[PDB]
Amino acid sequence: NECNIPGNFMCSNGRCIPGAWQCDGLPDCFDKSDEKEC
């Protein structure tokens, strides 16, 4: 959905990570939601 803090990307499980952690070659989400469509 939407993270409360503006500059964040939301994982599959609802955990918000920074937007510069999406598609970086390092796993951060459970089951790699930042590592799917890069």
* Residue ranges in contact with other proteins by CB under 8 A: 1, 4-8, 12-26, 30-31
Q: According to CB under 5 A, which one of 20, 24, 30, 36 is a site residue for Ca ion? A: 24
Lookup: tokens for 30:
């459970």
20 token code pair: 């510069």
Question: Residue 28 interacts with Ca ion (CB under 5 A)?
Answer: yes
Q: What are 8's strand-pairing partners? A: 18
13 CB-near residues (< 8 Å, 6+ apart): 29, 30, 33
- When asked if residue 10 is in the footprint of Ca ion (CB under 5 A), the reply is no
Positions in the binding site for Ca ion (CB under 5 A): 21, 24, 26, 28, 34
